[PDB]
Symmetry: D2
Subunit: 141 residues, 4 copies
Amino acid sequence: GLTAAQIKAIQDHWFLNIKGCLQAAADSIFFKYLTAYPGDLAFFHKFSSVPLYGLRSNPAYKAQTLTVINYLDKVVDALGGNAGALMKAKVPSHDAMGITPKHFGQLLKLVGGVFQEEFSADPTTVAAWGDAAGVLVAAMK
Amino acid sequence: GLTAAQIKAIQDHWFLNIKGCLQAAADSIFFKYLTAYPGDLAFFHKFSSVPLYGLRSNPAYKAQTLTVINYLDKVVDALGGNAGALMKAKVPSHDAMGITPKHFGQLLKLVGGVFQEEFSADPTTVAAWGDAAGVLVAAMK
Amino acid sequence: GLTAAQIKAIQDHWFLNIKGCLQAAADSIFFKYLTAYPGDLAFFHKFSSVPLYGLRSNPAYKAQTLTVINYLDKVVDALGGNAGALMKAKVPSHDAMGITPKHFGQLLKLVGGVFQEEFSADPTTVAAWGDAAGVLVAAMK
Amino acid sequence: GLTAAQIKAIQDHWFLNIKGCLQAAADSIFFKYLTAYPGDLAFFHKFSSVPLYGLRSNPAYKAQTLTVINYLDKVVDALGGNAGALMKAKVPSHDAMGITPKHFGQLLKLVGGVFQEEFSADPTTVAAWGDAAGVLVAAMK
Ligand code: HEM
Ligand code: HEM
Ligand code: HEM
Ligand code: HEM
Ligand SMILES: [C-]#N
Ligand SMILES: [C-]#N
Ligand SMILES: [C-]#N
Ligand SMILES: [C-]#N
C-alpha cells in the first residue's frame, strides 16, 4: 500500500538521483523494458526498426523516453494526491494504440530495480517503488 | 518583451537540451554567475568556503543549483501564463537576505549566453532568452 | 578463442561508447560486480563501509574505478599483442591482497553484459567480450 | 616553459576532471575553438554544413573531437618525455590540408580557459596549461 514515508523515500530519491539527469533515467527505464518485452518495440513506429543496441543513441527514442519521464516527474510530485488522476488521463490515448494497464504495470514494476542498479536507490526506496507501481496501475480503472 | 514565437523558441530548446540534464544546465548557470560576481558566494552559507574551482564537485552546490533550475523549469512551462507571479513569489524570502531584483537580473541575463556556449541554442533562442530576462524582472517589482 | 574480428568488435565499441565516458562505464562495471560479490567490498579499505547505494556518489569509489578503467583502456588498445602481459603485471600487487585470477575472471565475465545493458553493445561485441575474459585471465599464469 | 610541478598540476587535474569524461572535454574544447574561429569549420568536411548551434549533437563532430582528445590524452601522459614528438608527428598530414602550427596554437591556447570554466581547474593548472601550449607549439617546428 503507500504511506507518506514511502512517498518521501521516492521523492527524496527523485530529487537526489533522477531529476538532475532525467534523460539518463528515462533511456535505461525503457531499455530495460524493451529488452524484457522486445516485441512491444513495434508500438513505436518512429523507431520500431532500430535494433536494441542502437536505441540509446537514436534521437527518436530519446525524445520519447524524455516525454514519458517528464510526465512521470509530474506524477511523482503528485504522489500525495492527484497522481492517480494523472495516470488515469493517459489510458484513452494508449488504449487507441492497443496498450493496456498490463503494459504500464510491466514498465512501473521495473523502475525500482533500474533505480537500484544504476541510480543509487536504497532498499527502502526500491520497496516503495514496488508498492507505488501497484497503486498507480490500480488508479487507471 | 515576449511573443508566442519567443515562448516556443525557449520551450522547444528547453525540452531539447535542458530538461534531460537539468543538473548540468544548473551548475553552469550558477558557475557563470559566481565567476562574474564572485563576492555573492558569501550569501551561499552551505558552500561559501569552497573556492570557485571546487564548486561543480561540491554536493551542497549541486543541491542548491538543482533547487533553482527545478523551479525555473516550472516558470518556463508557464511563460504565456503565470511565469511572472512565480518569479515574484520568491522575492520576499530573498529580500530578507539582502538579495534584491538586482541579483535576479544578474542571473537571468546570463542564461541565453550559457545556453549558446554549452547547451546548443541558436541565435533566435538566445534572443528570446535575452527578452525573457527583462519580462521576468519587470514582473518582479 | 580471440580472432582479429573479435578484437575489432571490442575496439570499435570501446571508441564509440566507452572511451568518451570512461567514468560512467567504470562505476557500472564494478557496481555490477559488488552487487554480485558484496563481501569483496571488504578488500577496498578506502570505502568498505559505504553502503552499496552510496558508491556511485562516493569519490573514493570513483577514483578507484577510473584507475581500473584507465588500465583496461591500455589493455583494449593492446588486444592484438601485449594485452596478456599487461594483465600479467597486476597479479603480484593483487596477490599481496588476497585477490586471485578467480576474482579477475568474475569482473571480466560481467563487462559484456554491462556493455549490452547500458553501453549499446551489439551481440557480436558481447560474445567477443565473453571470449576476451577467458583469454585475459589465462594470460595471468 | 614546464617544471615538474606544472606537469603534476596538469596530470592530476586531467585524471580528476577530464579522463572520466573525455567526450565532454573534447566537445567543449572544439566548441570554444569553432566559436572563436568560425571559418575553420570549412576544414571539417564531414560536418561543415552543420551550423554552430547544432554541432554538440552531431555524431561526426563527436567522433572527430574524441579522436583529438584520445591523442591529447597520450601527450599529457608523456609531458616529461616525448609529448613534443607526438605533437610534431601530426604536423605533416595537417600541413597537407593547409592546417599549420598557427592553427594548433589557436587550439592549445584555449584549453586552460575551457578547463577553468567547465572542468574545475584551479589557477595553478590554468597557468600550467598556458605554458604547456607554448612548449608543445615550440616542439612542432
Ligand atoms: C508507464 C507510463 C507511461 C506514461 C505516463 C506514458 C506517457 C506517454 C506520453 C505523455 C505520451 C505522448 C502522448 C500524450 O501526451 O498522451 C506517450 C506516448 C506513447 N507511449 Fe506512453 N507512457 C507510458 C507507458 C507506455 C507503455 C507501457 C507503452 C508501450 C509498451 C507506451 C507507448 C506509447 C506510444 C507507442 C506512444 C506514442 C508515441 C508516438 O509515436 O508519438 N507508453 N506516452
Ligand atoms: C531566478 C533566480 C532565482 C530563483 C528562482 C531562486 C530560487 C531559490 C529557491 C527555490 C530557494 C530555496 C528556498 C525558497 O523556496 O525560496 C532559494 C534559496 C536561496 N537563494 Fe535563490 N533563486 C534565485 C536567485 C538567487 C540569486 C541570484 C541569489 C543570490 C545572489 C540567490 C540566493 C539564495 C540564497 C542565499 C538561498 C539559500 C538558502 C539556503 O541557504 O539554503 N538566489 N533560491
Ligand atoms: C579486472 C581487472 C583489474 C585490473 C586491471 C585492476 C587494476 C588495478 C590497478 C591499476 C590498481 C592500482 C594499483 C596498481 O597500480 O597496481 C588496482 C588496485 C586495487 N584493486 Fe585491482 N584491478 C583489477 C581487478 C580487481 C579485482 C577483481 C579486485 C577486487 C575484487 C581488485 C582489487 C583492488 C584493490 C583492493 C586495490 C587497492 C586499492 C587501494 O586501496 O588503493 N581489483 N587495481
Ligand atoms: C592539438 C591539436 C590537434 C591534434 C592532436 C589533432 C589530431 C588529429 C587527428 C588524430 C586526426 C585524424 C588523422 C591523423 O591521425 O592525423 C586529425 C584530423 C583532422 N584534423 Fe586535426 N588535430 C589537431 C588540431 C586541428 C586543428 C586546430 C584543425 C583545424 C584548424 C584540425 C584539422 C583536422 C582535419 C581537417 C582533420 C579531419 C580529417 C577528416 O576529415 O576526418 N585539427 N586531427
Ligand atoms: C510512453 N511512451
Ligand atoms: C538561489 N539560490
Ligand atoms: C582494481 N581495482
Ligand atoms: C583535428 N581535428
